[PDB]
Symmetry: D2
Subunit: 324 residues, 4 copies
């Protein structure tokens, strides 16, 4: 059997409420990893699992300094001969951010699978137990190697680069509308469909081993009447990058243009992304900043933060956006 480490960070998957139908007033990140494992003893037929408690928080409180430590820990684990893969239990709300960070920074082809749940462990029809079992199956399969970081929920295997939480509250929320899933798990069998045609993991140039902090990057929304003062505030607080969750294809109002030009004059890198949820922001030399390709704003922030650890050259940063 493969040796899988379950590295727990918190989330609703580790939530415990007073009744089976209670959806508020409980902490998302209360139960320990061994309680998760022991609720699905079937996992022991799939792998030799060892639980490690990395943190226990709601993912809306996950921070880059913590995700950096997570990446460093996972790199240490996967460097061991006695670790075949890692499953990371996490909150759903920012799992796409943490997962994409590890996608770019983990220097191994051994699987790294993020798993989460939309219902707490105490819920009627809780999804966490099956999601964890699926995640372990994926992490221990030798066919799962070399595929980049994955996010597994609801019988689907999503690439960290494409997968996003698309719905505030449903079990099927994690989708990649234009890129689909890497694979699916049906009837206790994994079906791989796609390999992502982007750089990642052992083919990624990003390395943050030995870093202890990351560049500051903020995200500003685009909308009718969007204000220039938010750009001024970000600049004043020393951001190194701004990701613009733009109207349409990174379109920018007269006010946003003024903000962006100010930022660029102070050496801030601006990435024009989109608030729409999907698709390509194409190059446009008449507008300020760089473009995000198909990265959504949350992902774009992660790639920009990592880019800024190793370059300040806009040409190189733009090329990263087209290749990672």
């Amino acid at each position: 059997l493969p040796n899988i480490v379950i590295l727990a960070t918190g989330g609703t998957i580790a939530g415990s409420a007073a009744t089976g139908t209670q959806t508020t007033g409980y902490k998302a990140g209360a139960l320990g990893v061994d309680t998760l494992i022991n609720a699905v003893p079937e996992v022991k037929k799939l792998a030799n699992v060892k639980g490690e408690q990395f943190s226990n928080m709601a993912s809306e409180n996950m921070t880059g300094d913590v995700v950096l430590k997570l990446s460093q820990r996972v790199n240490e684990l996967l460097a061991r001969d006695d670790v075949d893969g890692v499953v990371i239990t996490h909150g759903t709300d920012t799992v796409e951010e943490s997962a994409y960070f590890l996608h770019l920074t983990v220097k191994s082809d051994k699987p790294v699978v993020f798993v989460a749940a939309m219902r707490p462990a105490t819920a009627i029809s809780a999804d966490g137990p099956m999601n964890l079992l699926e995640a372990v199956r994926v992490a221990g399969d030798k066919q799962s190697r070399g595929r980049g970081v994955m996010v597994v929920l609801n019988d689907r295997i999503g690439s960290a680069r494409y997968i996003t939480k698309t719905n505030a509250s449903t079990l099927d929320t994690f989708k990649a509308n234009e890129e689909g899933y890497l694979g699916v798990i049906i009837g206790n069998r994994i079906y791989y469909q796609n390999r992502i045609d982007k750089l990642h993991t052992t083919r990624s140039v990003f390395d943050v081993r030995g870093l202890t902090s990351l560049p500051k990057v903020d995200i500003l929304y685009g909308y009718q009447d969007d204000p220039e003062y938010l750009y001024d505030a970000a600049i004043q607080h020393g951001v190194k990058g701004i990701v613009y969750a733009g109207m349409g294809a990174g379109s920018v109002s007269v006010r946003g243009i003024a903000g962006m030009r100010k930022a660029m004059e102070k050496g801030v890198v601006v990435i024009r992304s989109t608030r729409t949820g999907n698709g390509i922001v194409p190059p446009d030399e008449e507008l300020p900043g760089l473009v995000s390709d198909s990265l959504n704003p949350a992902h774009a922030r992660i790639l920009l933060m990592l880019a800024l650890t190793r370059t300040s050259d806009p040409k190189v940063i733009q090329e990263y956006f087209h290749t990672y």
Copy 2:
């Protein structure tokens, strides 16, 4: 034949580029309304059309003061016995905002149909001509009355309350993943599928006749490491409301909580929405602010602005979010 006014505001539908494949370096909002009409002379078999040029701008520059005028003009037009419906040509980037504004403020059951195009008029396979023809068909059909404000592109009829631009750059971008379309136009025939179960138009309390400006509302994004200083900036600039494009189901970090509590102390109304793109943000009294129900951040901003013209009572505002 029905008498339809085509009220033009700009957009890529009125864009004109130097070649058939050029997608940048042209102004979205350059062609006049009569050029659009004359490019589809078939529209004169469907309706007696009259063009009126309201504005000619890219929709990323549309502002609430201008949308207020638009609403007022459309009400004047629909008050006339010689006007059976209005088609509004507009940019795709913010059409959802303008349309939802009119959905709540137009005091007639006569059809109001927004139309737009993802490719400029000069493009190969431009979508504007057929979109405009479909929109005119919709606006003139007696079966279209009483349905709320509609957005028509790509053979689909979307409710202004549910429809959003979901993709930065595709023709099929306008979708309502959970709510579907009101109807479709296939083979020159309209097929109505749904009526929205929300208040609108003639049953809406919002009336902005005579107003000349609207309450200031900004939108802030939720993400890992989201900073409190953006709340401080918005407060300092005198916002009346803040819409939060939250992680997951309006989930809030410790920093966002501190920001939101500060804003609420100053009398700012905070609405928690979602950055995910779809779904319900459920109530949670322990978190700050009101919740957006299934309104996305752009729509939630429009409803909040209108709500604040009538009330500062949280109970009443929250009920608007559940019913409009």
Copy 3:
């Protein structure tokens, strides 16, 4: 509390397998209704429920003669003052057919909610418990009246007319891509979004009280090299109608045209539907047969069977396809 009858027919919701991960070799339709109710005692806080065992079969074996009796029983129940609504447990494979049959033949505005499960009751993270509780919530809410027959799974409320099983094996399979959901159930609260703009239930002309069988209707697939001999076989076995699950928009090969013309010469009514999964098959007088509007093949069969209890007139039948 509302009085709700849970009328059980079988399905995977009532399936019981030897382990938590076994997905084959168990009978869908083994557990009794009271075992379903007793697994979710929370239901007794939502309604006064009474279980009735109508049948216990896998839904692939559900037949029109049995669905007729199901409709007749439901009508009997809803005619009672002591019944406020009904939930029908059923297999997922043909629930859309049974549900649409009841949608057209149930003469009450009281809610009728079909419910099902993709994983058996014994499965890890079984969906049936929560699906049943959601269904009971929907059936007992006074806001649910007059909406037509509903299908409830995975926090979604779908209209019987639009909802279909879109995926062979996932929990989120029931979707209506173009029409959306009537509503959703999130955080123990129902959010109604739409009302279907079609005839149903109390406004439907179809009445089958007193019938003991239905007219025979088969479905033939369209594809490259589709054979004429399948039309001959159907005609020889006495079908009254044929639904063609056509290529594209009910397109027909030379072979299919010959088969259809032969069928129509014998008095068979032919409906051209689509194998695609969605959309409108538009009228085309140059092709044989009537068109299915947006009814998929399984639904189109149900409507044709019901139509043939009332009329043989093509004009009238075609109008049913456009209104039901």
Copy 4:
């Protein structure tokens, strides 16, 4: 510039109607290939194109014997040093069948791109011109090599293995809900997202050079009351295989089981697929026949026909269903 052959077979892309809004009463496959080319002279900046007229038919009339000749011709063309790629203009209705056939039988890494249109060439906002330009762009890019056969419409590049016509009548009908697109074409640039994780073209065992006909395979639908006599008819007419477009996950009624057992006793190979549109049909040794994995019925028929040119062995055929 690359040298691209445009091999025309017909379809609505080659349709010509009397007015810009006419959607019936015109032949789909009337215009010649040069007339398509001459409508988009921009193509000359992308490639040196040569048109060749293979056929001119509606795709509902495409037959396996003709697709076999199409595959043979494409193989001849791509064996030439002066051909870099091939674009095939085709009807939308069965493009997925012809494309998947070529995906398994074309013995080259040079791109083969099928292209089609939902609106005829004479239509207002006809999609064919831009679809053809995109297809030529894809066929001529050196990055497009080795990706398997592609289907290009509406700015999307779909794998022939996953893409299907999902809507009877809309421009955006070609989707792969679970597998996404291989890439997209926005702003005159190709963005590759995925590589399919299945065998195709140069790695495929299927070679039909020298064949003039193929094994007979029919498709039978699954539904309530599905009749055994259709199996008897297929058997009597000498089918070598039957693809069952099953209820749910290839579920079979008692009648279908009896039919399938009869077919198998006569040496017919039975593949259980799904009518649902998407997803995996899992193995189940208690049911008759082989399973289609995620192939939909139309694709399953194509694979089974090709498999039968080589083997009758169920173990090998089942493996093909899991790897092609």
